[PDB]
Q: What sequence folds into this?
RNA sequence: UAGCUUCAGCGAUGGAUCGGUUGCAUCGAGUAUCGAUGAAGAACGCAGCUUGCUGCGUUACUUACCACGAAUUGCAGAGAGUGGUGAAAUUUCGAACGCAUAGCACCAACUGGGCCUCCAGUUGGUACGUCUGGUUCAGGGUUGUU
RNA sequence: CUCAACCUGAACUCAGUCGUGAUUACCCGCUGAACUUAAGCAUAUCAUUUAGCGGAGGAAAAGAAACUAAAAAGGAUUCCCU
RNA sequence: UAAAUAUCGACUCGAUUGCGAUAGCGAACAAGUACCGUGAGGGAAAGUUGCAAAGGACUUUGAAGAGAGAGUUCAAGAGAACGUGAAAUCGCUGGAGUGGAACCGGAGACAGUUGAU
RNA sequence: ACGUUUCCGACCCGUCUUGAAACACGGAUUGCGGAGUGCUUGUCUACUGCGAGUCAAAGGGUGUUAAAACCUUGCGGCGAA
RNA sequence: AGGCUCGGCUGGAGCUUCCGUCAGUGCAGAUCGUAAUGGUAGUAGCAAAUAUUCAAGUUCGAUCCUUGAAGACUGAAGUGGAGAAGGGUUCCACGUGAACAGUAGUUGGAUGUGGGUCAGUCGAUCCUAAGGUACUGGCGAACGCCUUGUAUCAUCGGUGGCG
């Protein structure tokens, strides 16, 4: 019946592949039942089997992408699909450190000129 | 003889379906779409065609990516984080 | 009179929200008042009605009848109560929809979540009544 | 024409699928207003300008 | 066809004026927005005056107005030197500096010099680091009286 | 008598009027967020029964996670289902990218055909312009050395 | 004639980047009519405006005087009243 | 090189001396849809049963549409194209007129209507 | 009284026109919709407040039945040559 | 007088006096817009392409559907048998009540439910024709245009040895 991704999170790659194959075989059997005048009770399981396949694929992809992200976390250049998907303009923006960069003249101006805190009596 | 007699000779299409807009306005001999301008890189729109612009403008379709971006902006385009690990 | 600038007193907006509310919001909309005895027993005034509750009809042509609620037809904003039925022409039996606001709860179907909700409501009622 | 293109055939197949009477059980749905498929097409009356 | 004694028409409506129309239905909204902006700025820069920099005293240019005075952009370098304030010190203390204005008359210079002196007298200077006050820095019971000024400084 | 006209009563045809109103118009307020990480738009497809509309993309009227807490509903059917949404996924055309523009072709690996120079499958890749650097170069253009 | 520099110019499926195309309410640069009014009409007007092309942002553009002026002088830009 | 300034095109909100289905956006509804043109493009009509389908079981004539009974319902003369249901137009029953128009104003009569502490 | 019958009178409305019942044009019938408006600028007139003054602009202050109301002008418009 | 009050019937949820003030404020016409409806009127008409008849079947019901017999027609440059463009399921089978088939209908290119198109050899796919469109180059305020040409031009690939 309805699988639990919480349980699936503990299986291995081979086990998940085997379970996916079993679910696909069950779906094929249900399609055969559909075509050969199957009962409504049988036909009602197609949605459950399809969503079970979806859950298995979700777990597989999540595990694979987590592993790849860990592997490439330290590389200077990462695969395009592992980079941050913000807006195009946000990606083209300057980095925080580059924005924080200041020239020698600017640093000297910051040192010398500095606004104070004051109040004016009415 | 213009009219009924001449209408019997109309069996060669001058326009076909366009790859970009799906309209039957692609001129075969000119190799250009009379509606969207394919294969021109840019899109065909004229300010005198206000109703045409309204018909073919953004928002008349699905705007799947635009809606996705609008939804994601509401939380600052946060990535690499998941909801607090909890249960039922 | 409302004071919140972000709450609309527009009849059209209110009606649109009511009639396009999603299921979880219709759950809150379909609330019923507790009887006097149950109100003193549990400390709350009203709760979102639930299946398997026991109610008594307080108004309408079926006033005074009692039974268990079978279904909460949220799509139709009504609840079907046990034994509140009529007969179609052919003879079959059909439950008569009743609006939960016109019944009164006589017994609550309590589980973990419902007990927690009742406790929350009672604590809030105690706090606000003490402040008042 | 007998000698046609696959994409024209695909469009014709979709039109064939679309040209179909409305299911009868849809008329029993809550709030339903449709009483028939109001977009039925007859091959001889209305023509697909492909 | 004008008839009888009339003043000849002059309305400038021969252009497609319907394309360029401006209404003022948002005047109170703009007023509220500017009040809110002033409040936000006051919170941001408290306890400093909301008006901002101190402005100088000026004489209106032409003879039609030269009997009046108004606020200026800032204080000239001559004025700052006469009042004994450096340009940098004025910038950090919150005094507008008009680098373009120059004084050609002792009376005009002296009026603004007196204005600067009075502002310096009324000024309250908080410690740069609260723990360690320095010289020129205002005293603690003076700092306890500090309040935000609203409107023009030294109106 | 009949027919015709007219009056009273009754009934048709027709859909005016009245009664609201999840719609429209205008005013005001808050925010700044499309695209080669593939946009806008288009095409096709996806449901147990579901043409259209709406939703979605081969995990296809949706998966995961989190909040709430018992339904969906036309018939079936069996932590529900709703909301949020940070994880995963997101078909083909389209700036649309191997070349063309509704077709055919090149490179590499791996797998199968028994072997493979021949086939088949899978995967990855081959667009234009431009910046920085790298490698291999061309010119008595200028110069030095043998 | 050998080798080595520079200069200029190439090829690379060389390593890593970037541009293209959309949107129209506002914004920036160009191009640019006629109807109409003149009781006709050509300068004029409509109008440095419909239409056409290109280019951005959340605002854009402008902006710290080769300024205004002629007082006992004002002092970047933008916007409002006059 | 920010601020004051412009702008609802996009997203999200609050209002109104505005319209109330021939009005208001073209579109209150499977509306930029049906449909039309080779194409640029053009472009509608279409809101309302009832509180609740309780949407008329069953008998009867007919091949059927449909009708006669019956039942539901505050009510079905609210019966599905279903709130109300106008005028034009039309059919029936009864009365009265009726020689190439008919209608109409003034004045009586008849029929008729209505009032009488 | 839009019924019938008598006596007298009785040409089809709208429109342009010197002149329409016209052999002048529009009108088969009914429902619903349908046309001197908005704004800027003048002038006269009527009413209201103040009066050699009057109105105050943008703006500012306040106001939460906060787009309102209330307060606020060396200066500006018109008038006083 | 513009109109108004009341009575009776229908109807089922709003309406109203008076005081100020405002207006998308009054229709017989505009060959007015839109929707509906009359007399004409059961009238004009349903007359080109030679032609049908008998018996039976099915059906509630047959000039028109089906079977048999007869009589005619196209007459091989056909009213025959197949294709290209175009159509797009109209193809085939089984039901059919309403609409449509300007009579009818048991029949149908209609309508409801299903079924149906199988390629190494037939075509596309491949070659180029007229011609189109790119690259450079030039022009152009620009979208982009012009040339398909020694204009432009550093545009490569073939045998062999070695490996």
A:
């Amino acid at each position: 019946t309805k699988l639990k991704c919480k349980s699936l999170r503990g299986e291995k790659k081979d086990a998940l592949q085997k379970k996916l194959d079993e679910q696909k075989t069950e779906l094929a059997t249900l399609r055969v039942s559909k075509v050969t005048g199957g009962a409504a009770s049988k036909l009602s399981k197609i949605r459950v089997v399809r969503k079970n396949i979806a859950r298995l694929l979700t777990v597989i992809n999540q595990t694979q992408k987590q592993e790849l992200r860990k592997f490439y976390a330290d590389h200077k250049y990462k695969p395009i699909d592992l980079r941050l998907k913000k807006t195009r303009a946000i990606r083209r923006r300057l980095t925080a450190h580059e924005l924080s960069l200041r020239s020698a003249k600017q640093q000297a101006k910051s040192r010398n000129q500095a606004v104070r805190k004051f109040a004016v009596k009415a | 003889t213009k009219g009924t007699q001449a209408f019997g000779k109309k069996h060669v299409k001058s326009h076909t379906l366009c790859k970009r807009c799906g309209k039957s306005s692609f001129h075969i001999q000119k190799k250009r779409c009379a509606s969207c301008g394919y294969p021109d890189a840019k899109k065909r729109t004229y300010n005198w065609g206000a109703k045409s612009i309204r018909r073919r403008t953004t928002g008349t379709g699905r705007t799947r990516h635009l809606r996705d971006v609008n939804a994601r902006f509401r939380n600052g385009f946060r990535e690499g984080t998941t909801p607090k690990p909890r249960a039922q | 009179m409302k004071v919140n600038p972000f709450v609309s007193s527009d009849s059209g907006k209110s009606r649109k929200a009511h009639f396009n509310a999603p299921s979880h919001e219709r759950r809150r909309i379909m609330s019923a008042p507790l009887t006097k005895e149950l109100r003193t027993k549990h400390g709350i005034r009203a709760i979102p009605i639930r299946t398997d509750d026991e109610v008594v009809v307080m108004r309408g042509r079926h006033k005074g009848n009692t039974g268990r609620v079978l279904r909460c037809y949220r799509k139709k904003f009504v609840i079907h109560i046990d034994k509140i039925t009529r007969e179609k022409a052919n003879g079959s039996t059909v439950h008569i929809g009743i609006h939960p606001s016109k019944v009164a709860i006589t017994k609550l179907k309590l589980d973990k979540d419902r007990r927690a909700l009742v406790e929350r409501k009672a604590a809030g009622r105690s706090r606000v009544t003490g402040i008042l | 024409s007998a000698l046609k293109k696959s994409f024209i055939k695909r469009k014709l197949a979709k039109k064939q699928k679309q040209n179909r009477p409305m299911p009868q059980w849809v008329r029993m749905k809550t709030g339903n207003t449709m009483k028939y498929n109001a977009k039925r097409r007859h091959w001889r009356r209305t023509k697909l300008k492909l | 066809a004008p008839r009888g004694n009339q003043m000849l028409g002059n309305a400038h409506f021969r252009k497609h004026w319907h394309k360029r129309i401006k209404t003022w239905f948002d005047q109170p909204a703009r007023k509220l927005r500017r009040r809110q902006n002033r409040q936000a700025k006051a919170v941001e820069i408290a306890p400093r005056p909301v008006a901002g920099l101190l402005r100088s005293v000026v004489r209106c240019p032409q003879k039609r107005y030269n009997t009046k005075t108004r606020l200026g952009r800032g204080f000239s370098l001559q004025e700052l030197k006469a009042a004994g304030i450096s340009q940098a010190q004025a910038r950090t203390i919150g005094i507008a500096v008009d680098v373009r204005r120059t004084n050609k008359t002792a009376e005009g210079l002296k009026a603004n010099a007196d204005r600067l002196k009075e502002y310096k007298a009324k000024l309250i200077l908080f410690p740069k680091k609260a723990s360690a006050p320095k010289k020129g820095d205002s005293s603690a019971e003076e700092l306890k009286v500090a309040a935000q000024l609203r409107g023009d400084v030294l109106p």
In short: Chain B touches chain D through three residues (CB under 8 Å). The two ends of chain B are 82 Å apart (CA to CA).
